[PDB]
Design a protein around this ligand. Sequence first.
Ligand SMILES: Cn1cncc1[C@@](N)(c1ccc(Cl)cc1)c1ccc2c(c1)c(-c1cccc(Cl)c1)cc(=O)n2C
Ligand SMILES: CC(C)=CCC/C(C)=C/CC/C(C)=C/COP(=O)(O)OP(=O)(O)O
Ligand SMILES: OC[C@H]1O[C@@](CO)(O[C@H]2O[C@H](CO)[C@@H](O)[C@H](O)[C@H]2O)[C@@H](O)[C@@H]1O
Ligand SMILES: [Zn+2]
Lengths: 315, 410
Amino acid sequence: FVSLDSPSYVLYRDRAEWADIDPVPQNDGPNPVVQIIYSDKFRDVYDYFRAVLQRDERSERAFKLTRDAIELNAANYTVWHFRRVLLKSLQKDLHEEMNYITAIIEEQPKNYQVWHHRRVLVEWLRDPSQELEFIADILNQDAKNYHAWQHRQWVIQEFKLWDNELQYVDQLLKEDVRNNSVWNQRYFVISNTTGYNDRAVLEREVQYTLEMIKLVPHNESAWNYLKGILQDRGLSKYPNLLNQLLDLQPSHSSPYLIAFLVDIYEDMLENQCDNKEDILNKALELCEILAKEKDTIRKEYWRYIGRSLQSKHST
Amino acid sequence: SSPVWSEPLYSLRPEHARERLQDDSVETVTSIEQAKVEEKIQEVFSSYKFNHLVPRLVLQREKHFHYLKRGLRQLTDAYECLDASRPWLCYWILHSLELLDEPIPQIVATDVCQFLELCQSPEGGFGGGPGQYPHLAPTYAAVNALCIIGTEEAYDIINREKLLQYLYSLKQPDGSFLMHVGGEVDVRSAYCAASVASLTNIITPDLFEGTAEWIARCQNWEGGIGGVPGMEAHGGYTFCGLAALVILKRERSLNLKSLLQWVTSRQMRFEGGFQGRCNKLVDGCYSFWQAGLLPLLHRALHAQGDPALSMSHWMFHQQALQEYILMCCQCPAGGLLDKPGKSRDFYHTCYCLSGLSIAQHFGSGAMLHDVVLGVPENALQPTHPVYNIGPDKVIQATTYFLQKPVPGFE
Ligand SMILES: Cn1cncc1[C@@](N)(c1ccc(Cl)cc1)c1ccc2c(c1)c(-c1cccc(Cl)c1)cc(=O)n2C
Ligand SMILES: CC(C)=CCC/C(C)=C/CC/C(C)=C/COP(=O)(O)OP(=O)(O)O
Ligand SMILES: OC[C@H]1O[C@@](CO)(O[C@H]2O[C@H](CO)[C@@H](O)[C@H](O)[C@H]2O)[C@@H](O)[C@@H]1O
Ligand SMILES: [Zn+2]
């Protein structure tokens, strides 16, 4: 009916329809700590929320009250829980509640409770028809919102809406190829649909990734994705990749390419590669280059790798 | 060498300028934001250099102390948004004071205990405030705060019987835990549960059945850990995941190699601090969430007999992290923060200091090696990498509770 900022808003202690119930003040003890000096409006709403909660009143007035409590602090999970208890007890129209949660998330997209509430509603309705479009709108404002992506993966997997996600992924990568959240979604979609065992799919992904690397050599996400889709089988199982990266090294000696080479050498040595001594020497040289010049922030890591290699393959 | 009044800094070396972002002449929202932060950080870095004169960095202890002391008592309505996270405030503030080696007056200690008692739910666990439903986040915070106080009065506040029952009420068949009744699920719950259960000695054989496997499923292609299976790797969730596994003694359920490479890659070559996930921005709180993973990995690998492990340093740039925190994360008015330009808050004050402590102290077996950048007074008290409270507090708490039986279990 009336919002906390509406000119005609009235404090609950002044509402005649609330006169029959006594407010319950918050007891912080005689010598309080981390005591928040609440505004009159904040305290007013929560004094009455505490009253309805204590009396477990499943009413329409209590339901409307939770809306104000939420506006005052959307992170109060106790209020959210009670609201859900009321939604069921009062048999409220869930599609109406969906419109409400949509507006709330738009206002506060970085909050755990609002996204969980929406998930519960979709679960109760078994209706994901609005999800992908709504999420897309949130992501249009913040393409990396963690909660948004998490909710998106849930909906897609729970209701099997895989059909158009790879196209969505491709669109967002075109907008920002550095968006690590989108590269994650890419792996999510492929691993759950075709999988990476299909050599045709893997080839397509390696070519796609290599192409992105050529376009933006210093974009770490693409390099991480490349390693991510080949690491389980073992980087040394892809002999042509080494040569191709070796040919780009002179013109693209970024720390990412140099590090990838070490990763390849590490795996090769672990698989009884030919010319072990030569591979080891090359790996140690790169580790030193990374530690001393190309990736000094990780010098301790690279020195550790150098020692590990020697403890495992020096013979 | 150098006179004692001048200390050369990594971030101020001439070669450091080469660590600036290379956008390959391809601009996107990501590179634009990163470049903006780097530009501001360079300006900050430069203000601490006067040609060859580089004064020692100073942790503004007293300013931080006054900010913390004030917050432990009262807060303005600007904190209404944290009305459901008050035990968090107690923990962040108490831990910061503990790190700064500032004693907690007996009266304050008693008042905090009384307040947390009021936050404890009759069903077990702690809520964000008096009368609120219990939740694992404030429960984790309350238990840590009580352990920092470390008095029998504080220890006894915890209703161990109900706490265990409460944890059971949140345990899912797949090994995960709800954050609260009818709440959401993510790796934070596993860590909060494992932390409070191990500290209070209420772990049963079945409590964490399947939990280690669920956490492992959260590790993704990047090497780090996401909030739930399939999600992007993030420092916050990776700390929770690995720390919980260390408590359960199941770290080997993860691919430690890909995790190590992932976390070390999260330290920013230019800023020196850590980002929360690939291609996002540096942030002072990750000084703990991310950097804190190195001591855990060190211990994990060491248990496996890794002969290549260092005996004096963590596997991240300890000096660079200290430089970022000391030069970029201190509010001149007291308190610490995310990055230059952001406002202070008790959360960032807690984690910036926690990360600084981890960066200053290396410890493995009998080997101890300190690296305190700046004036000697910058040295903070050590913090336990698993619980993030003083190691002395961890030992005293676990010893106390180990003398009690596991609630209704033998
Ligand atoms: C994501 N992030 C990075 N730095 C700070 C944040 C954070 N977005 C945040 C959100 C969720 C979680 Cl679980 C942890 C951290 C954030 C940002 C600012 C914050 C707080 C939290 C928190 C806060 C509030 C409740 C719980 C936790 Cl863990 C943190 C308090 C606070 O005073 N401020 C200013
Ligand atoms: C024990 C415990 C409760 C630990 C919590 C650790 C932690 C910091 C979690 C953060 C998770 C998260 C949703 C980040 C997104 O915020 P963002 O998009 O603002 O983050 P970003 O840009 O830094 O990634
Ligand atoms: O970092 C990769 C590492 O993580 C594990 C889990 O410990 O699996 C994750 O990564 C795989 C891709 O490399 C995904 O297929 C899997 O779903 C995800 O959990 C390890 O198996 C792997 O070595
Ligand atoms: Zn932060």
